[PDB]
Amino acid sequence: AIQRTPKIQVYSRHPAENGKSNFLNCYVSGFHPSDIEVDLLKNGERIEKVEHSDLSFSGDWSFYLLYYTEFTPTEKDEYACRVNHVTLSQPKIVKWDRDM
Amino acid sequence: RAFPGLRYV
Amino acid sequence: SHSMRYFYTAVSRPGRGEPRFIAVGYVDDTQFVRFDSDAASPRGEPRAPWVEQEGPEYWDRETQKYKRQAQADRVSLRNLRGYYNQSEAGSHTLQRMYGCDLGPDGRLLRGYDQSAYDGKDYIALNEDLRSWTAADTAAQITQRKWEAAREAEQWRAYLEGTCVEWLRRYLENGKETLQRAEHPKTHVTHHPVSDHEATLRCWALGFYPAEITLTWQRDGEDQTQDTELVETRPAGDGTFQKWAAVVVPSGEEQRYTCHVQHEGLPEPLTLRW
């Protein structure tokens, strides 16, 4: 019935250090219904080995999912999360900002 | 340990 | 206090097959089980080490329960569409959350069994575990069916017995991880936002359980209404992250302090930029 758009957060599991393996996360939350498209991008290109948590939801019935991939950050490589949802007319792209 | 019962809405 | 919580989601997909059913189970903030009806020959699967030794009869039993629930939810979704006179062309979602909360003595504080349809309350087992609250006249059809079939008695038996007993068993089996707090690792970042203001952001990383308090003060005075808080998010390894930010006049950063409260910290931590 009422649809809720996802909040989107892109971040690493541990503080990033160039050359050290890590995990890149895209956390989507607060959305309804549960169907959602989430891709992790490296320099604009979809990352292939990306997994996600099992679908669950919060007390207000809205859903949340963690998408993640193992990665080794470098100074020059750019990462982002691309999300599409029925509430979104075009995909939303959120960039990873390590200095946040 | 999940609920064992079952009833339609 | 501790809790065990199950979350069921069933979603119809007209013209793309039969409804998909997903279940997950948690003790406190730690998932321990999943089931996905779209898997080929689906099974209840462990997601925490402290149920991996439960054995095949247990896992066969949980799998049997999930398969029956998945099939039944297909019937329930069809019934609901009929109650509401909804079009078969639209997709719909049925959710259930249930479980038990325990006090420090292991006694049941509260049991739950609440359902939602189309993203909003449909029917809920009341606190007394003996009566129902229906959200509308469609849910009143379900309520009369469940009252005639003594559904509440079955849930109460589970919530006051099985739920409590198995939660206590999981807590003992997994005590090395479930009953141990992980303190947050903290730092402050700083970003100018204009010629005259700057963002101070206080980070807490790697903590368990998820409950945490992050606050900002200006010369000791709480800045509650000026602090931006993000919802606590998973790190992906079973721990959590949170940040709290404040926008301050450039040159006044030195007045501000971040304060961190967590079960894993015997004394609150103070940070400054």
Q: Closest-CA residue in chain B for C33?
A: B1
Which of 164-193 (C) contact A at CB < 8 A?
Answer: 189, 191
Q: Where along chain C do its domains lie?
A: 2-178, 185-272
Q: What is the DSSP string of C65-107?
A: HHHHHHHHHHHHHHHHHHHHT--TTS--EEEEEEEEEE-TTS-
Which of 82-121 (C) contact A at CB < 8 A?
Answer: 91, 93, 95, 97, 116, 118-120
Name which of B1, B6, B9 is nearest C69 (Cβ-Cβ).
B6
Spatial neighbors of C123 by CB under 8 A, at least 6 apart, are: B9, C114, C115, C132, C133, C134, C135, C139, C142, C143, C146
Query: Does residue A23 lie within any of the structural domains?
Result: yes
How close is the nearest chain A Cα to the Cα of C219, in Å?
24
Long-range (24+ apart) CB contacts under 8 A made by C249-256 are: C249/C196, C249/C197, C249/C198, C250/C192, C250/C195, C250/C196, C250/C197, C250/C198, C253/C190, C253/C198, C253/C200, C255/C218, C255/C219, C256/C200, C256/C216, C256/C217, C256/C218, C256/C223
3-state secondary structure string across C203-215:
EEEEEECCCCEEE
Coil/strand/helix, residue C140: helix
Residue A25's H or E segment, with its range, is strand A22-31
Q: Does the beta-carbon distance from C145 to B3 stay under 8 Å?
A: no
The label of the residue with tokens 């997903």 reads C22
Task: Please indicate the experimental technique that yielded this structure.
Answer: X-ray
Resolution of the experimental model in angstroms, please? Answer: 1.9
Coil/strand/helix, residue C188: strand
Q: Does the beta-carbon distance from C158 to B8 stay under 8 Å?
A: no
Spatial neighbors of C176 by CB under 8 A, at least 6 apart, are: none
Query: Does residue A1 lie within any of the structural domains?
Result: no
Instruction: Give yes or no for a contact between A39 and A82, defined as CB atoms under 8 angstroms apart.
Output: yes
Query: Does residue A2 lie within any of the structural domains?
Result: no
Query: Does residue A73 lie within any of the structural domains?
Result: yes
* Cα–Cα distance measured from residue C182 to residue C206, given in angstroms and rounded to the nearest whole number: 7
* Cα–Cα distance measured from residue C77 to residue C60, given in angstroms and rounded to the nearest whole number: 26
- Phi, then psi, of C168 in degrees rounded to 5: -65, -35
Interface B:C, Cβ pairs < 8 A: 50
Rg (CA), chain A: 14
Q: Domain C185-272, what architecture? A: Sandwich (2.60)
Number of domains forming the structure of chain A: 1
Q: Does the beta-carbon distance from B7 to C79 stay under 8 Å?
A: no
CB of C79 less than 8 A from some CB of B: yes
The two tokens of residue C129 are 């575990």
- Per the rule left: phi > 0, alpha: psi between -120 and 50, beta: everything else, C15 is left
Query: Does residue A100 lie within any of the structural domains?
Result: no
Alpha carbon distances (Å) from A9 to A75, C34, C95, C102? 21, 24, 25, 33
Q: Does the beta-carbon distance from C205 to A53 stay under 8 Å?
A: no
Q: Does the beta-carbon distance from C93 to A100 stay under 8 Å?
A: no
Q: Closest-CA residue in chain A for C233?
A: A27
The label of the residue with tokens 């090395």 reads C176
Q: Does the beta-carbon distance from B2 to C146 stay under 8 Å?
A: no
Terminus-to-terminus CA distance in chain B, angstroms?
22
Query: Does residue A24 lie within any of the structural domains?
Result: yes
Domain range holding A73?
7-95
Instruction: Give yes or no for a contact between C8 and A56, defined as CB atoms under 8 angstroms apart.
Output: no
Chains touching chain B through at least 3 C-beta pairs below 8 angstroms are C
Which superfamily, per CATH, for C2-178? MHC class I-like antigen recognition-like (3.30.500.10)
Coil/strand/helix, residue C141: helix
Q: Does the beta-carbon distance from A54 to C31 stay under 8 Å?
A: yes
